[PDB]
Amino acid sequence: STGSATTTPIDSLDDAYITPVQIGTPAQTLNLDFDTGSSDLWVFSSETTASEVDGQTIYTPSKSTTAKLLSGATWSISYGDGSSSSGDVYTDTVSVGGLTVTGQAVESAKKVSSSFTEDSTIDGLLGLAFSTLNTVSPTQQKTFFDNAKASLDSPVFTADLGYHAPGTYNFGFIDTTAYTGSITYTAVSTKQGFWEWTSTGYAVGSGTFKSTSIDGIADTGTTLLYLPATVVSAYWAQVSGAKSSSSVGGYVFPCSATLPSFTFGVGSARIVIPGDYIDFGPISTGSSSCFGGIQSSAGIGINIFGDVALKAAFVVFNGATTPTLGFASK
Numbered sequence: 001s002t003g004s005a006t007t008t009p010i011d012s013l014d015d016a017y018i019t020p021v022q023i024g025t026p027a028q029t030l031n032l033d034f035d036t037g038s039s040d041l042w043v044f045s046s047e048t049t050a051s052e053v054d055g056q057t058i059y060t061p062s063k064s065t066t067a068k069l070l071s072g073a074t075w076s077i078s079y080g081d082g083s084s085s086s087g088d089v090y091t092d093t094v095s096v097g098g099l100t101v102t103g104q105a106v107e108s109a110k111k112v113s114s115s116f117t118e119d120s121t122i123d124g125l126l127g128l129a130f131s132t133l134n135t136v137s138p139t140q141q142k143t144f145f146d147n148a149k150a151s152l153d154s155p156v157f158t159a160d161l162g163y164h165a166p167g168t169y170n171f172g173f174i175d176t177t178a179y180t181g182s183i184t185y186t187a188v189s190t191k192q193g194f195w196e197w198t199s200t201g202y203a204v205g206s207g208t209f210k211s212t213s214i215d216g217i218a219d220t221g222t223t224l225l226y227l228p229a230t231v232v233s234a235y236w237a238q239v240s241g242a243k244s245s246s247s248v249g250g251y252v253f254p255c256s257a258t259l260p261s262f263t264f265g266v267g268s269a270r271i272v273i274p275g276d277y278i279d280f281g282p283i284s285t286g287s288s289s290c291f292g293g294i295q296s297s298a299g300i301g302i303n304i305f306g307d308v309a310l311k312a313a314f315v316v317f318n319g320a321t322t323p324t325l326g327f328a329s330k
């Protein structure tokens with residue numbers, strides 16, 4: 001089997017991407033944020049505190065003939081931006097782009113933090129990291145990808161995120177028309193439950209490439225590119241007037257600037273992020289100070305290849321017995 005679904009930026013900055021997902025019988029279509037940095041599939045639901053729902057589409061398990069309460073199971077998650085959600089769990093049929101999993105754990109939110117309520121465009125998350133991070137208790141649950149893997153033609157999914165445009169998540173096959181050149185594959189460590197890999201270095205604009213190992217995660221659920229402070233300083237030093245602002249919470253730059261590209265290494269290959277991908281626009285409406293798309297990871301404890309980086313590539317998440325990641329230009 002295979003699946004193929006279009007993923008769409010939620011706003012004009014590509015702050016996140018939503019992909020439609022069919023849950024239950026008859027189908028209830030919810031727009032989920034596919035997140036390779038987490039491992040819970042959770043949704044706004046008929047159980048969500050009513051004051052915490054503001055325009056999202058909800059899953060109502062009582063209207064699904066295939067929903068079954070997973071008795072006793074609860075879940076609770078916190079994300080690196082401080083947001084969180086929690087609730088109970090049902091199993092139900094879940095389809096993505098024509099690929100169906102029966103008995104998928106669908107984690108129904110009873111509570112969501114303010115950031116979720118305030119984002120009417122995201123109806124939930126679909127976790128695609130390793131199942132060892134799944135928060136369900138007392139019996140940890142598998143991700144949609146783990147449940148589907150055995151049926152898939154090839155035990156892979158691919159992320160092809162667009163810049164200010166739709167893109168695609170595919171399951172079970174590699175679309176050889178979707179990228180240029182070859183795919184370079186690199187080793188993955190699952191020890192922290194993430195798609196954790198080691199970049200071979202970086203370049204700023206037309207500058208010389210610096211060979212240096214940068215350990216970090218491929219995280220579709222994170223907007224920006226978070227890298228060591230030395231790297232980020234070198235990038236922003238090339239932008240006249242850029243500075244790190246404690247009041248804003250990162251690097252800002254004059255909106256009048258033209259940003260340089262940023263290249264990261266994947267083995268001997270190179271992925272170039274165009275400068276325009278690094279512009280996240282005015283810090284507040286009407287400001288001429290713009291927010292940078294490359295920020296320091298020093299506060300986080302891990303480097304994160306988020307959407308800014310991933311949208312410059314066609315990315316293979318290879319869930320073979322020994323997982324690997326593949327990157328190609330496109």
Ligand SMILES: O=C(c1ccc(-c2ccco2)nc1O)N(Cc1ccccn1)C1CC1
Binds near residue numbers: 039080081133221304
């Ligand atoms: O939001 C998280 C994050 C945190 C915790 C968990 C997790 C799974 C299960 C329990 O906790 N999963 C994440 O997905 N980021 C992305 C991030 C962090 C900080 C700033 C920006 N982006 C990843 C790094 C851990």
